[PDB]
Amino acid sequence: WERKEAERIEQKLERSEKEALESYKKDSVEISKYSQTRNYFYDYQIEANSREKEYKELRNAISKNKIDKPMYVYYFESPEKFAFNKVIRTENQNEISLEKFNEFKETIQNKLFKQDGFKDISLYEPGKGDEKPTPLLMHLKLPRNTGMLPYTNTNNVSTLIEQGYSIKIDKIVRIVIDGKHYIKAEASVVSSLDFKDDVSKGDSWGKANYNDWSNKLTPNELADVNDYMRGGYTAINNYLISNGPVNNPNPELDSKITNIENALKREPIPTNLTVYRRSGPQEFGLTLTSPEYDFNKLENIDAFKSKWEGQALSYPNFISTSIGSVNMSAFAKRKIVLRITIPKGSPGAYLSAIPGYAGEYEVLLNHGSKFKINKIDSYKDGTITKLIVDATLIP
């Protein structure tokens, strides 16, 4: 039924892929956790890791096989993955209160949450002997051309996938399974283009999509924006931060700002894209010596999430972002990394498309942009723990 289907797949796998799958079957948790946060290190750090080979073999084995139609998958998810820190119900309780249901409902009202790791799923709804570790059950519809690896584990045909998308929850209801209340969510995948570590692919895509962008620029404003981004971007941003047009109005810098905005507005981004930026404490209203900047202790992260997660954002100046997610020596101290999803059609441009040292895979966004923070999560970077913020740009 599925035993010969699992066989026909494993037969055509490599011996290295087979031993990688076995090592996953033995120590799945650590491998999944590593795959979640693997792309936020240095270029050479991710190369010398003693677990990168396993990740590469597993991702190749998964992506070898793809599906041709959308289909639904079923799994249990921890409710804190959707930025709900409270408990829906304890593991021994049997009933879910209406207040908890409502709190979970307005927690996930209009948001997108990103999933970036290996996962073990099922193609059939949970039954009787199936493990039910969380009070949240997910009905997710996968898109076409997504990879699944059906492997037998102690007879049970299990399925393994890798997540590279962001999901949104449409409707939630309360159901009963074996005398226990569960929250059942219907979710859908929102496709996006994400170059995590392979900056080569992102650079090639940006070149192909924005090397002709300069041609559409009128030459005077082209040289004007070019001279800005070489020498005067710091001055323009500093003038914008101090609310210069309102406090000390002057047309000399307002002309530069208008030219930059128009040039960025000329050609928008054609596809949903994700960019990574390392943010400083002054952006969040903190100082380098503030005690809360130390994320080793739990209370600092808890307070930061309580005061920032789910709220809005506003950057009067321009935002400098890079396609890649690897750590750079220019912002090594920055403990806060910002993950931004760019909706299709939003203003922006690939600065590094033009020849010369335009930056490090630089992508610029229009000033005055607003952001919404969906979820905030933490990962350990050597002897210190850095903090990851997931956000969506709104028009």
List contacts with other proteins (CB under 8 A): 68-71, 90, 92-95, 98, 101, 123-124, 128-129, 141, 144, 171-181, 184
3-state secondary structure of 390: strand
3-state secondary structure 55-101: HHHHHHHHHHCECCCCEEEEEECCHHHHCCCCCCCCCCCCCCCHHHH
The verdict on whether residue 93 carries a ligand-binding annotation is no
Beta carbon of residue 272, minimum distance to other proteins (angstroms, whole number): 13
Beta carbon of residue 26, minimum distance to other proteins (angstroms, whole number): 20
Judged by CB, which is closer to other proteins: 281, or 343? 343
Judged by CB, which is closer to other proteins: 168, or 367? 168
The verdict on whether residue 3 carries a ligand-binding annotation is no
Judged by CB, which is closer to other proteins: 123, or 286? 123
Judged by CB, which is closer to other proteins: 68, or 299? 68
The verdict on whether residue 248 carries a ligand-binding annotation is no
Nearest Cα neighbor of 350 from 204, 249, 178, 168 is 204
The verdict on whether residue 156 carries a ligand-binding annotation is no
Judged by CB, which is closer to other proteins: 145, or 242? 145
Beta carbon of residue 141, minimum distance to other proteins (angstroms, whole number): 8
Distance of alpha carbon 203 from alpha carbon 122, whole angstroms: 36
Q: In this structure, what token pair is assigned to residue 286?
A: 């903190």
Judged by CB, which is closer to other proteins: 143, or 245? 143
Beta carbon of residue 93, minimum distance to other proteins (angstroms, whole number): 6
The verdict on whether residue 237 carries a ligand-binding annotation is yes
Sign of the Cα pseudo-torsion (48, 53, 56, 58, in order): negative
Instruction: List CB contacts of 283: < 8 A, sequence separation 6 or more.
Output: 315, 336
State which H helix or E strand residue 392 sits in.
strand 384-394
3-state secondary structure of 262: helix
Say if CB 55 and CB 117 are below 8 A apart: no
Chain breaks in the chain (C to N over 2.5 A) after: none
Beta carbon of residue 284, minimum distance to other proteins (angstroms, whole number): 37
Nearest Cα neighbor of 115 from 63, 37, 171 is 37
Q: Taking the mean position of all CA atoms in its chain, how far away is CA 173?
A: 27
Beta carbon of residue 84, minimum distance to other proteins (angstroms, whole number): 17
259: left (phi over 0), alpha (psi -120 to 50) or beta: alpha
Distance of alpha carbon 147 from alpha carbon 74, whole angstroms: 16
The verdict on whether residue 283 carries a ligand-binding annotation is yes
Judged by CB, which is closer to other proteins: 11, or 155? 155
The verdict on whether residue 334 carries a ligand-binding annotation is yes
Beta carbon of residue 171, minimum distance to other proteins (angstroms, whole number): 8
Specify the residue for token string 């005398």: 179
The verdict on whether residue 277 carries a ligand-binding annotation is yes
Specify the residue for token string 């010596």: 289
Q: In this structure, what token pair is assigned to residue 280?
A: 């400083």
Judged by CB, which is closer to other proteins: 179, or 231? 179
Angle at 49 between CA 43 and CA 54, to 5 degrees: 115
Beta carbon of residue 17, minimum distance to other proteins (angstroms, whole number): 24
- Residue positions forming the annotated binding site for NADPH: 233, 237, 277-278, 282-283, 317, 334
- Binding-site residues from annotation: 95, 181, 233, 237, 277-278, 282-283, 317, 334, 367
User: What residues form the annotated binding site for Zn(2+)?
Assistant: 95, 181, 367
